[PDB]
């Protein structure tokens, strides 16, 4: 479903903005993890 179902408020806005930044941070961390794993995987393919 489209929305998180938290009720609008300035506190809700702060919470959701923090959660968005957290999700983006996790996305970047996991993406760098994926890049590292893929680099090692390609190296092992060559070897």
């Amino acid at each position: 479903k489209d929305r998180i179902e938290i009720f609008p408020s300035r506190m809700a806005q702060t919470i959701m903005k923090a959660r968005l930044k957290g999700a983006q941070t996790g996305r970047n961390l996991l993406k760098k993890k994926s890049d590292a794993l893929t680099l090692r995987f390609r190296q092992i393919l060559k070897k």
Partner: protein
Amino acid sequence: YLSQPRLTYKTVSGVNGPLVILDHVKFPRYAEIVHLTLPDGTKRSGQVLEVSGSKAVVQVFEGTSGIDAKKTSCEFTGDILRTPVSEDMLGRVFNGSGKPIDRGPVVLAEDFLDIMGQPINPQCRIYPEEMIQTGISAIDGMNSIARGQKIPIFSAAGLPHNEIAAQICRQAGLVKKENFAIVFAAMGVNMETARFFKSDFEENGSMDNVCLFLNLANDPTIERIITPRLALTTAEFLAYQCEKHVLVILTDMSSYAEALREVSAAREEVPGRRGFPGYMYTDLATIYERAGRVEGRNGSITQIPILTMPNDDITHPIPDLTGYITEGQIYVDRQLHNRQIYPPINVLPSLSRLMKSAIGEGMTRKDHADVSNQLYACYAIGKDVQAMKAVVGEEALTSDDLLYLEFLQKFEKNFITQGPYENRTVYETLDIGWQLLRIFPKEMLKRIPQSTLSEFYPR
């Protein structure tokens, strides 16, 4: 000049909040100044907030408590608020309304100036050019300030933005490769911080250049309103008439905005975005834009507004309109503050739009722009690598990543971290920047031309 006797009225017709409504007034002026004597002999100042027919809505500076009809007298001074200005008020302390609080005498005016001032003519405003060194490396070497720039510090509540401001006020000056001045204006500053400013400047001897306005948190909010305008009227006098480069440091424009909200609501105006008046953009611009170099006058005015962003929301009207009106931003960072790095100036989101004019040959030094860009790039890569380090672990990093992490550590420890009383000329900040960039070999300094590397990299 006014050779005309003043009129004193007892015709108080109402008292509603901070407003004394008088009636039967002879030709009231809007924004006239008024001295009202309470029944007991106390005297309070005030300003004609509104006018209609013979009525006069005198907003009293102090509270209206103790005012009554039928006995309060109210002398209409016959003129708008004009501040006396001289060079002698360089090296003084004044409360928000211009009355000295340094146990010195009242200002013997070289001139009387209307605090509202007039907008600087765009065709006469000149591009700012040269640098004003602040002594703080995190801005002198990465976000330097041009003479005429308005570049606010954005900080949250509880970060050491007041301490940074006091340091800038103590240290700032021309790059010196006696016509400099600072007008400090604290709005809504609590007693402890006001006493801190007053004692700090006096002690560390910058006072001969500092004109200090303090509007304590318990001083009238209307006085808070007129504090930055006194500060900037004095700045205009010293810069565009006495021809000296003035740095205006307006502390807590968030507090100024709260005072503006109070006065707006007193006028009974319906709130705007997030409760602030709709015209806050124009008001903040009337304050900020009293800056910049002008045609044919050696003097200039540089501004460093300081903002307490509520809730740390950069979209909040105060910081948002300040970002629209000013020409950069210097972020103060909670993470650095907790890590105990001082000054906690996060250089990544901070930006100085006219740094390219502030720096360069004949202004700071030939290598300033390249060192700045390289330090920023290496810092960004260092943060990226520090994020990757927890994913892959130190033993899996390449040697370049280790060099970037060493640079990050030494950058936050030697370049950013300064200590409140360590004054660094821009040359010394650049030498530290080069000591940091010598962590890497030349080949990874990809944003510094070889022309500069060959000249500055060695040693």
